[PDB]
Amino acid sequence: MRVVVIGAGVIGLSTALCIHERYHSVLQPLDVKVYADRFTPFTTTDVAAGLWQPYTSEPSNPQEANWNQQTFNYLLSHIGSPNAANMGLTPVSGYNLFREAVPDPYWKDMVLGFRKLTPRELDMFPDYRYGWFNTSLILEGRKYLQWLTERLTERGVKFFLRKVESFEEVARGGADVIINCTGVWAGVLQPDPLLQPGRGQIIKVDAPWLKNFIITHDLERGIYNSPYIAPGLQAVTLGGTFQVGNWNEINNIQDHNTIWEGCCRLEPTLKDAKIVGEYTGFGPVRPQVRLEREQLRFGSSNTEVIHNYGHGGYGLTIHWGCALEVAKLFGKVLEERNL
Amino acid sequence: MRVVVIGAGVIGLSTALCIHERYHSVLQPLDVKVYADRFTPFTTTDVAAGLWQPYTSEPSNPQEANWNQQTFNYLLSHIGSPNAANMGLTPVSGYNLFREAVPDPYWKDMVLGFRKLTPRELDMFPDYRYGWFNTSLILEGRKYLQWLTERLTERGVKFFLRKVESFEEVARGGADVIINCTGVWAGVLQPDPLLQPGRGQIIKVDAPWLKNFIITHDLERGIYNSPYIAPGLQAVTLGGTFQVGNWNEINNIQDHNTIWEGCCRLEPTLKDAKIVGEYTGFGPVRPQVRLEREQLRFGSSNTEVIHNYGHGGYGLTIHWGCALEVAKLFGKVLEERNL
Numbered sequence: 001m002r003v004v005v006i007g008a009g010v011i012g013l014s015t016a017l018c019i020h021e022r023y024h025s026v027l028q029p030l031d032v033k034v035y036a037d038r039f040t041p042f043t044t045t046d047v048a049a050g051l052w053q054p055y056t057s058e059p060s061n062p063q064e065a066n067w068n069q070q071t072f073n074y075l076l077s078h079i080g081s082p083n084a085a086n087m088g089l090t091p092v093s094g095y096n097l098f099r100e101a102v103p104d105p106y107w108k109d110m111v112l113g114f115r116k117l118t119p120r121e122l123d124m125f126p127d128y129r130y131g132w133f134n135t136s137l138i139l140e141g142r143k144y145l146q147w148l149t150e151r152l153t154e155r156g157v158k159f160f161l162r163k164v165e166s167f168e169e170v171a172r173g174g175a176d177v178i179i180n181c182t183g184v185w186a187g188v189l190q191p192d193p194l195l196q197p198g199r200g201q202i203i204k205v206d207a208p209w210l211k212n213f214i215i216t217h218d219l220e221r222g223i224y225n226s227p228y229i230a231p232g233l234q235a236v237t238l239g240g241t242f243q244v245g246n247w248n249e250i251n252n253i254q255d256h257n258t259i260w261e262g263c264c265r266l267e268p269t270l271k272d273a274k275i276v277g278e279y280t281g282f283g284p285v286r287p288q289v290r291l292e293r294e295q296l297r298f299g300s301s302n303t304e305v306i307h308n309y310g311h312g313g314y315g316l317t318i319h320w321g322c323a324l325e326v327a328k329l330f331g332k333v334l335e336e337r338n339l
Numbered sequence: 340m341r342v343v344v345i346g347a348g349v350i351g352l353s354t355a356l357c358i359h360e361r362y363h364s365v366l367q368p369l370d371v372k373v374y375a376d377r378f379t380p381f382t383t384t385d386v387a388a389g390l391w392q393p394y395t396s397e398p399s400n401p402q403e404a405n406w407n408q409q410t411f412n413y414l415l416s417h418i419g420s421p422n423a424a425n426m427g428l429t430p431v432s433g434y435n436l437f438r439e440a441v442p443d444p445y446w447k448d449m450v451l452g453f454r455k456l457t458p459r460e461l462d463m464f465p466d467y468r469y470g471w472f473n474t475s476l477i478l479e480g481r482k483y484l485q486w487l488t489e490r491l492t493e494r495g496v497k498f499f500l501r502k503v504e505s506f507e508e509v510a511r512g513g514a515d516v517i518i519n520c521t522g523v524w525a526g527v528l529q530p531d532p533l534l535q536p537g538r539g540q541i542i543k544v545d546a547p548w549l550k551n552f553i554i555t556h557d558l559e560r561g562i563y564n565s566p567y568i569a570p571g572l573q574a575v576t577l578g579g580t581f582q583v584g585n586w587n588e589i590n591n592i593q594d595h596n597t598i599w600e601g602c603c604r605l606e607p608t609l610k611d612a613k614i615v616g617e618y619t620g621f622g623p624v625r626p627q628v629r630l631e632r633e634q635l636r637f638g639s640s641n642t643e644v645i646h647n648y649g650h651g652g653y654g655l656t657i658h659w660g661c662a663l664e665v666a667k668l669f670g671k672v673l674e675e676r677n678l
């Protein structure tokens with residue numbers, strides 16, 4: 001076959017690798033290209049802290065807790081390999097703070113050492129009156145993308161810089177299968193106004209004395225409109241804003257003062273952390289992940305398409321579940337085609 | 340008053356500020372001097388990884404457990420300061436690992452969120468069957484010595500770089516009180532067959548991705564002769580030698596490999612850490628602390644000695660208690676002359 005993957009973010013490259021691991025032999029050669037107008041370090045994936053943690057409450061699609069679980073277990077299996085940290089993978093422990101007592105999350109027994117905070121702990125945090133502690137994982141976006149681009153190149157997957165204009169023009173290029181992995185920009189190739197953009201600003205600092213994460217939660221304001229501190233491999237991610245339907249790609253100063261004041265509130269040692277950079281990304285926000293097979297018929301050419309977009313603010317936390325599931329749908333295509 | 344504090348380790352310098360805090364207003368001539376033949380970075384205090392944890396066993400003495408507790412609550416008080424990290428202070432989370440089960444430590448309720456390690460956690464560590472998890476504090480000796488000398492200097496304490504050959508010489512020099520904070524070399528000033536050297540080799544590596552300290556215990560081998568990993572503010576301490584009685588300050592090739600292989604078995608990501616330095620020091624190992632008053636007279640000059648040494652492999656952890664205690668004993672000495 002001639003396979004083409006559109007997108008080189010986490011969801012792109014992970015999905016391209018999951019396929020090629022499962023469906024390629026020396027006697028059964030496969031040809032995967034990867035098309036993309038942004039590669040690392042310039043993707044939305046590169047911008048994300050990389051902490052493994054789904055959302056507080058239940059999920060509307062219960063496939064998506066299962067994809068979350070499969071991703072955690074795939075990741076944890078690499079903890080203790082010599083290469084973990086070369087994938088961008090390190091364990092980390094932290095706090096989730098709240099203004100009110102809330103139910104436990106469904107993932108409580110997926111993570112390591114989940115528990116409620118003590119009174120003493122809650123005085124480290126004067127503005128908060130309930131929380132949790134747990135150990136989890138940092139899968140750093142920029143590093144995992146580097147790791148994947150390498151593992152994928154040893155297996156002869158070729159790379160092309162190119163802004164695709166429509167699925168049409170990829171069918172005419174002579175493509176049997178298209179894997180669509182464009183996160184927030186899939187609503188250009190084929191309309192979908194259920195896909196809004198999630199606009200998050202982060203500040204990256206040198207504050208190497210911070211080893212725990214700290215996530216605040218304001219339930220009114222919704223996910224990631226409330227201070228967070230995530231240690232990384234080489235630097236620390238301050239964040240705090242997540243505006244849905246805002247398309248502005250510039251950094252802007254309100255978001256800065258909001259992330260800086262609220263994060264200093266939390267960890268006042270930050271007055272001496274030097275700022276390394278400021279960044280803005282767009283979440284592929286969608287009420288459910290669009291992961292499904294679709295046949296198309298572009299004038300002359302018939303094509304086979306699988307979408308993998310709309311992972312919102314949880315693409316790293318779920319990617320490998322999604323990536324596996326795609327290769328299923330790809331398998332079923334191969335069953336019809338006698339190969 | 341003329342006070343000469345011998346020693347500029349954590350013990351001397353903390354004791355010295357403790358004193359001058361409690362008594363510069365209410366003693367109109369109060370003159371304090373620090374004599375020492377090593378200042379930071381050449382003390383044993385500078386080799387210490389900096390973690391607050393006592394010995395796993397019960398204490399040798401009820402007073403010591405209180406001093407460890409006083410020190411903990413004191414340091415914790417500064418958590419939340421803007422200047423925590425310029426003191427050398429940041430919180431840290433981590434694991435203690437055993438080859439067999441063992442009882443809870445007496446300090447389990449002093450530290451934050453202490454618990455037993457679950458089965459999944461223990462698969463993360465295949466050469467161990469039991470352990471704890473908890474949150475405690477890094478107090479980096481090197482930063483903290485620095486903070487102490489600044490505060491002392493603000494307050495007008497004077498430092499001298501010199502060898503004290505005897506208590507006699509200091510006494511005839513004008514010393515009313517002498518605080519003896521000489522650590523492992525205290526025996527030189529007045530024999531002590533109980534006080535011997537716990538020799539420890541360590542390796543500083545650059546491995547910013549390790550966030551959690553890891554301490555192993557083989558009870559056959561005695562305490563801290565067993566790989567440990569300790570993240571600092573700016574580097575990571577690898578060690579696991581505490582050979583009592585050895586005075587050899589040259590680094591030895593045997594101990595390097597023991598620390599290196601053993602730490603690499605523990606965190607295999609260490610294959611990629613850059614080695615930054617390798618150093619040896621001597622804990623003042625002694626069945627219990629020597630902290631007590633002693634009068635000595637030479638000719639016609641009576642002089643009050645107060646000892647404060649023998650803190651072994653947990654000096655940072657105990658330091659503040661002791662110093663308060665010595666401030667209390669100084670307190671007596673004053674009232675026995677009427678202020």
Ligand SMILES: Cc1cc2nc3c(=O)[nH]c(=O)nc-3n(C[C@H](O)[C@H](O)[C@H](O)COP(=O)(O)OP(=O)(O)OC[C@H]3O[C@@H](n4cnc5c(N)ncnc54)[C@H](O)[C@@H]3O)c2cc1C
Nearest residue numbers: 007008009011038044045048164183200281314315316317
């Ligand atoms: C501030 C912030 C913090 C976050 N933190 C976390 C976190 O801690 N944990 C977590 O799990 N998730 C987090 N996320 C979510 C995460 O960033 C995304 O879910 C994930 O990166 C999406 O991957 P993607 O491949 O779908 O999108 P992207 O990374 O943006 O990749 C899209 C790719 O498709 C390409 N493409 C798009 N349009 C076209 C076109 N027309 N032609 C050709 N190529 C095209 C792009 O150029 C790019 O290569 C965060 C997001 C933000 C903004």
Ligand SMILES: Cc1cc2nc3c(=O)[nH]c(=O)nc-3n(C[C@H](O)[C@H](O)[C@H](O)COP(=O)(O)OP(=O)(O)OC[C@H]3O[C@@H](n4cnc5c(N)ncnc54)[C@H](O)[C@@H]3O)c2cc1C
Nearest residue numbers: 346347348376377383384389390503522539653654655656
């Ligand atoms: C490898 C290693 C790791 C450790 N890790 C930890 C840890 O994680 N946590 C913890 O709590 N503890 C730890 N310790 C223990 C800690 O380092 C000691 O308990 C502490 O340093 C003792 O402080 P001190 O002032 O007694 O000794 P030192 O810091 O050695 O200072 C003694 C001072 O006295 C001076 N002096 C001595 N004799 C004379 C003389 N004749 N004339 C003039 N000056 C003199 C010296 O010059 C020096 O200034 C560790 C020790 C080692 C070796």
Ligand SMILES: N[C@@H](c1ccccc1)c1ccc(Cl)cc1
Nearest residue numbers: 388390539552563567569581652
């Ligand atoms: N008691 C500390 C020690 C270690 C070796 C030698 C002497 C003392 C120590 C240092 C670091 C960590 Cl992680 C745990 C304990």
